[PDB]
Paper text:
As a model biocatalyst class, we selected carbamoylases, which promote the hydrolytic cleavage of N‐carbamoyl‐amino acids.
When challenged with the synthetic ncAA precursor N‐carbamoyl‐ l ‐3nY (cam‐3nY, 2 mM), SmLcar (10 μM) yielded 6.1 % of the ncAA after 24 hours at pH 6. Conversely, N‐carbamoyl‐ l ‐3iY (cam‐3iY) proved a more challenging substrate, with SmLcar failing to yield detectable levels of 3iY at pH 6 and only providing 0.8 % of the ncAA at pH 8 under otherwise identical conditions. To rationalize the massive performance improvements of our engineered carbamoylases, we obtained crystal structures for SmLcar and the double mutant SmLcar_GC. Comparing the resulting structures of the wild‐type and the evolved variant revealed a striking difference in the orientation of the substrate in their respective binding pockets.
Residue numbers in the entry:
A (entry chain B): 7 to 416
B (entry chain A): 5 to 416
């Protein structure tokens, strides 16, 4: 029956958006920047004012706990991320974290007690923008990455994740992944166009498509772009161009349910009149179909070296991100659907297109996701947009799904 | 003639000493224009020149002019010029050989007690390379009236630092009006940066021409979007447009052989996140030909096809020329002088069309100009493994020396 405070939630989103603003009304609040520090501090202060106690793990993940009435009951987590892309929207990650805070504030308002404690979770470096892989803290949590692997990830300026975590003062004391969860929920914008296009308020997320991030390092020969005869050039840029085209072909020949593309690129030494000695870029390929994902990976890894060999270019590939398609916990999926039905919101099943911390939580606990629409499916763009009504409806569903799972006690 | 030759060892030592300033990671140099290492190199060069009796002037572009007087106080100077600034992956010999061969010619004239009618001016042009700040040949460009001082000063590097502020910072903002000097003649000695002299077993390149260039900077506008969740049919992929442009440039280059090059050395994605399609992709296409019609045909074709590639993908396309000169013909009288010097000295020689751009290309606009080349191993340049021998260096310096003496005129 009872709804969260839509205005309080919205105001919190607008306040958090002031921290680490981008250039176009979104956010550039990347993981382990001073702006990330400030956002974490603001979130902490709100949660502490709402009666939550804070724990922080050695990956900087923040766990804000509301007690249950059963002191041995495992917690129901509500998680997402406050770190953003360089061209981040105000809603990616933030909606889920702040909807957790609002769920708690509404429980406080209504004097609600639950059997299971509730833990609002802010995972470090979900985005994998500054340091790859994405979902890095939740990955250490679920036992997929070592702490030392995570700490040694570097940004483009050669700064290491571990040192930056230490720099901004968010190194916590808890062993990563020492917490066991009764259940994990994550509310997130769709980052796709389906809910909007289908006129559905709520995405009942059943699955998440898998990914490989394959980082290519191509070795060319630095040479003068003026005086070097064409047939003596070892052109790693041209090899990269052919690889990008080949990735487009691979993605298109695996439709529907496949994507492939490149967002990050570096030439060295990156002089206008020097052919690059090194060209580094990451191919992002995804599919909800396991066999398709692995076929795309195998094909790209077989074809790309041949492209390079034809040009005399060296080719090295490193996986800097990976998870197989995820199936969310079917019982919690039904809980989400039942919450939508109880509240009178339209819903449909979705397969998440993006990766989320929920994907790793799913390895160690019953996990599901809830989505609201976003305009044009636009995300990782500062123009990312949802309405107050969209935000609120999904937060209501989160609230009720959590209450059903954590169990209201009079 | 017979017997007046430069000191090969002194020249070589000077190259090896200068190579210690702003070393790269593989035995070459990363001594880019208007870095502190450039400052140190300039100061070392200055001190050597001053020890050889040369007097220094510096212009507002930081170009250094080191004068050996002549016997006629109204005679205009014969310049010997090149550049001490390097690429990030620079060789020890590109630019440096020409400047230090100037110093060596002067030291040899001093050793032999030679007097000339015309003064000799060893010239170190600022920012020939156009690595850090584009265009290349920036100071010689201002000198020859191609660029305004304010255009040059406003050039920015990838860190957003401006050329004018950096020039001032390292202390090389001089007082002379740029281009106030008139030259009787200009010579530039440079490594070939191509494989021909070595392959043809020739000691000296009698440079007759320099191939022309366009540097076309593309700015492609895509739409930032999530690389996971965005359907393929909704993507506005500026990276893919760039890939197709690079491929089209390769096709253009290959269909225009022989005597054409096209390629890309510089690229930027924004925001350059692994899971964000780029909102902006910026890169520079370098196309060259010795043939004017071919050069302009390649430019017109690239500028016509690239917007079509982009339009097919919904990508915006903007093109700016950030460097250009038409093929250069060097002064025939000075070419003959160079050839005659090689013949007098008994060096094997052949004619060359320079593949690279040089400060000489702008000097040619305002004075009788030519170039001399020596071989380099495998034609490799803009790579730290750039290599010449002591003997190659010295032979070309001898030719420079004799060409300069003929032009400046020995006075007993
Ligand atoms: N909001 C983030 C979406 C998940 C993402 N880091 C990814 O590349 O899948
Ligand atoms: N330094 C020798 C090469 C000249 C160069 N600025 C070019 O791109 O042509
Ligand atoms: Zn997210
Ligand atoms: Zn995101
Ligand atoms: Zn040069
Ligand atoms: Zn050069």
């Amino acid at each position: 029956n009872r709804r969260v405070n839509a205005d309080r939630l919205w105001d919190s989103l607008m306040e958090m958006a002031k921290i680490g603003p981008g250039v176009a009304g979104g956010n550039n609040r990347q993981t382990l920047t001073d702006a990330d520090g400030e956002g974490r501090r603001l979130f902490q202060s709100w949660c502490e004012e709402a009666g939550l106690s804070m724990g922080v793990d050695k990956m900087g993940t923040m766990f804000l706990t509301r007690p249950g009435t059963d002191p041995d009951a495992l917690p129901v987590h509500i998680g997402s991320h406050l770190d953003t892309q360089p061209t981040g929207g105000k809603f990616d990650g933030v909606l889920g974290v702040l909807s957790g805070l609002e769920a708690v504030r509404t429980m406080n308002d209504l004097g609600i007690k639950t059997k299971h404690p509730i833990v609002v979770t802010n995972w470090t470096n979900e985005e994998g923008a500054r340091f790859a892989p994405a979902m890095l803290a939740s990955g250490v949590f679920a036992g997929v990455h070592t702490l030392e692997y995570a700490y040694a990830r570097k940004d483009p300026e050669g700064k290491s994740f571990g040192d930056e975590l230490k720099r901004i003062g968010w190194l916590g004391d808890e062993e990563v992944g020492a917490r066991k969860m009764h259940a994990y929920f994550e509310y997130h914008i769709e980052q796709g166009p389906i809910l909007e296009a289908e006129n559905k308020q709520i995405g009942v997320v059943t699955h998440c498509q898998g990914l490989w991030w394959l980082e290519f390092t191509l070795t060319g020969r630095e040479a003068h772009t003026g005086s070097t005869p064409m047939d003596m050039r070892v052109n790693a840029g041209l090899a990269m161009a052919r690889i990008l085209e080949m990735v487009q072909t691979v993605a298109m020949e695996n439709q529907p349910g496949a994507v492939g593309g490149v967002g990050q690129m570096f030439f060295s030494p990156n002089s206008r009149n020097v052919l690059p000695g090194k060209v580094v870029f990451t191919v992002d390929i995804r599919s909800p179909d396991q066999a398709k994902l692995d076929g795309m990976r195998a094909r790209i890894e077989a074809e790309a070296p041949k492209i390079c060999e034809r040009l005399g270019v060296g080719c090295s590939i490193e996986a800097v991100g990976h998870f197989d398609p995820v199936t969310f916990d079917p019982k919690l999926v039904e809980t989400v659907r039942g919450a939508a039905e109880k509240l009178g919101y339209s819903h449909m099943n979705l397969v998440s297109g993006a990766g989320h911390d929920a994907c790793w939580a799913a390895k160690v606990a019953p996990t599901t996701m809830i989505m609201c629409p976003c305009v044009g499916g636009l995300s990782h763009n500062e123009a990312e947009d949802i309405s107050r009504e969209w935000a609120a409806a999904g937060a209501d569903v989160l609230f009720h799904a959590v209450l059903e799972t954590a169990e209201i006690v009079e």
